């Protein structure tokens, strides 16, 4: 056992040395000569009311007009944000929902939370009512995130320090991803859908191949739990928001952290993160009841979304980049632009 | 607008009405978070998530047991029922550390903890037997004496009372180390047979609401 520990320490030292030599320069000093964004002044164009408890999760549909919202009141609501209408009101079986997702086709929506089950709901069906299609049991810890790959493939991350890929038709785990020491709090599917990254409470991020089922890379730059993870639209990087009160942008081809986003006055953790269509604006939702629009290339707060009376829990963008959505503990979902 | 959009708006209005009705029905309940560890009777206090519902004096309580990030979910909850086992002393320090962690939890700075000390019957039996001495685990016990005028008992052993009060004092002065008065630890005793636990929780929740009101009025 001592020989194994020595070999592990030597391999870790080799990894650190090899990745330390690849750092010829720093993204911060490579982006010191560009045009800064300025002020990202975003007004609340719509405010969605009807949720009577903390909003925990929200996910845009593929058409950038429909969105799902899951709140602690135990109700999934589909919003037509163009006319602020309620297309559907989905009552959940458990009110401790921490994540929700919208199928790319638009026929299904996924939701999960403290019950360790990812429930799938069919929207577009005869009889004119949303109904439960499939429940995905097998995770040991609470579900932190979930994202559809297609009508029959969904990746989830749980607090048991694992991520899973599920076939919905068979409702079976095709692949299990292992290696995280802490609870996995967020997962982001790649634009190609081949890979996905996950951050956990062990203050590390890991990149996983969906088909192979192995861990291609592992990242560690945080000194606190990573609560949110979002893939850069290019698919060759990601961003992680942690309890460290900072965000951090990692790459995949370099295998080491590239940027950190922090403020002296910012001591609250980062509840959520997301990227604009350009990926040039890393939008983060904090616990201080507001969101910061970080310049992902400059790591500067070029904007603030201060309209929430409580913690911002969820923060996402449309697929066309025309609006952002922020859901807070004040029980109101807001669309900003 | 179009006739289709008029019908869509009508449907949205009906959905809003249904949501308002559901919220009005669900607003009255009081939530509680159950915390503890094994061999502590945590889940044997009242008779994914093992949520339970029980009513006392026309007040409905929803106790939630989970199975420490996720505690954020229970941030606006009435109280935390933190059960501890005061029968085994080797893990008593572990329970004290867990109590410290929960009491100082950033998300729980305003949540009063209804602290429970279980299996006091086992604790008394161990004290009577004398096989294990709390002083072996907490040396300060050897230099501890029960308060003279604050020992209301039904006629129990002075040794049992002294040990119980020592453990309770350790927990209570961990609680009051830094509380600022925004939340209070309520200690109690349970022997797995005392059915008067829901009453204690109800009284402590009433006290918590009363303290919140007084703080709003600056009377406290």
């Amino acid at each position, epitope marked *: 056992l001592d020989q194994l520990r020595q070999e592990a320490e030597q391999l870790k030292n080799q990894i650190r040395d090899a990745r330390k030599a690849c750092a010829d320069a720093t993204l911060s000093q490579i982006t010191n000569n560009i045009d800064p964004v300025g002020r990202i002044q975003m007004r609340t164009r719509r405010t969605l009311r009807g949720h009577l408890a903390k909003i925990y999760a929200m996910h845009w549909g593929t058409d950038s*007009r*429909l969105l799902v919202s899951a709140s602690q009141d135990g109700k999934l609501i589909i919003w*037509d944000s*163009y*006319t602020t*209408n309620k*297309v*559907h009101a989905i009552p959940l079986r458990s009110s401790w929902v921490m994540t929700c997702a919208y199928a790319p086709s638009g026929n299904y929506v996924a939701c999960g939370g403290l019950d360790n089950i990812c429930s799938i709901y069919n929207l577009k069906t*005869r*009889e*004119g*009512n949303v109904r439960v299609s499939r429940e995905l049991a097998g995770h040991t810890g609470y579900l932190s995130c979930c994202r559809f790959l297609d009508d029959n493939q969904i990746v989830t991350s749980s607090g048991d320090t694992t991520c899973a890929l599920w076939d919905i038709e068979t409702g079976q785990q095709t692949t299990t991803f292992t290696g995280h020491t802490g609870d996995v709090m967020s997962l982001s599917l790649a634009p190609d859908t081949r890979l996905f990254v996950s951050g956990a409470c062990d203050a590390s991020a890991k990149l996983w191949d969906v088909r192979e089922g192995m861990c291609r890379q592992t990242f560690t730059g945080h000194e606190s739990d990573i609560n949110a993870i979002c893939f850069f639209p290019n698919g060759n990087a990601f961003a992680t928001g942690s309890d460290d009160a900072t965000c951090r942008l990692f790459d995949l081809r370099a295998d080491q952290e590239l940027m950190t986003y922090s403020h002296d006055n910012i001591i609250c953790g980062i509840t959520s993160v997301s990227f604009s269509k350009s990926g040039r604006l890393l939008l983060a939702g904090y616990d201080d009841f507001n969101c910061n629009v970080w310049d992902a290339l400059k790591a500067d707060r070029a904007g603030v979304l201060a309209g929430h009376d409580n913690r911002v829990s969820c923060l996402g963008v449309t697929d066309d980049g025309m609006a952002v959505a922020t859901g807070s503990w004040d029980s109101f979902l807001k669309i900003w632009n | *607008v*179009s*006739a*289709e*959009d*008029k*019908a*869509a708006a*009508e*449907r949205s209005k*009906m959905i809003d009405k249904n949501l308002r009705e559901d919220g009005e029905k669900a607003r009255r309940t009081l939530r509680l978070l159950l915390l503890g560890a094994d061999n502590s009777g945590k889940s044997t206090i009242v008779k994914g998530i093992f949520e339970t519902k029980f009513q006392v004096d026309k007040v409905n309580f929803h106790m939630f047991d989970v199975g420490r990030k996720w505690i954020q979910c229970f941030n606006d909850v009435t109280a935390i029922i933190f059960v501890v086992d005061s029968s085994d002393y080797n893990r008593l320090q572990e329970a004290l550390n867990d109590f410290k962690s929960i009491w100082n939890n950033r998300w729980l700075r305003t949540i009063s903890v209804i602290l429970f000390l279980n299996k006091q019957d086992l604790l008394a039996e161990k004290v009577l037997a004398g096989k294990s001495k709390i002083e072996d685990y907490f040396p300060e016990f050897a230099r501890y004496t029960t308060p003279e005028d604050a020992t209301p008992e039904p006629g129990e052993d002075p040794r049992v009372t002294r040990a119980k009060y020592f453990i309770r004092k350790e927990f209570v002065d961990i609680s009051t180390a830094s509380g600022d008065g925004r939340h209070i630890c309520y200690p109690h005793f349970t022997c797995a047979v005392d059915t008067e636990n829901a009453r204690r929780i109800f009284n402590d929740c009433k006290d918590i609401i009363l303290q919140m009101n007084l703080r709003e009025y600056n009377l406290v």
Partner: single-chain antibody
Amino acid sequence: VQLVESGGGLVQPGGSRKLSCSASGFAFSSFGMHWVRQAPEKGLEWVAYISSGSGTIYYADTVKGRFTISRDDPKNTLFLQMTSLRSEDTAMYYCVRSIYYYGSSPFDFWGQGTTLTVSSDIVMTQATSSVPVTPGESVSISCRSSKSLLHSNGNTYLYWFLQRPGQSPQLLIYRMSNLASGVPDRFSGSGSGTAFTLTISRLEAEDVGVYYCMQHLEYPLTFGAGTKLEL
């Protein structure tokens, strides 16, 4: 999804009758109901409309005042009370379901009607009252409208129904561009302002009947004359 309709029978002029439509197979409470009649040999004619929850009700000027439309959601039934029957009120009556929300298909399901015999508005026209066709050929059927059915929200409110002999109308295309469920992908629709066309490629058997185009921009709901396709 079934909509079984009852009523009909012989009626003396000037009397009254009650038509019923029992629904079974969908969330009736969430659907708005419609009544559409068809003269013995003429086209289709909208009659009435009741929305979900009975909040909004509409009638046809031709029968307004004498007709009443109601619904019993717990009983899952739709009722049409008729009063002061005229010699022009002899026809086959159908009940239709239509749910209204973003990306929905109104007039999705019709039913088998009941026969009744007694002893301004947007207008769309179909120039072709009969168009012989052959199997395997491609047929385009156009039907224009009085005004532009395009709306500010971007929806072109045109619907297509096919009525095969001895059968109820069935929806094919809704909002002039969206295919229905269960309809083979051979059918399609397209066009621009006031110019609406329906294309059928690789025409096959079981595709013979009267095509009707309908509008939904504003009440009353008016049908076309009806283009009949023969072998």
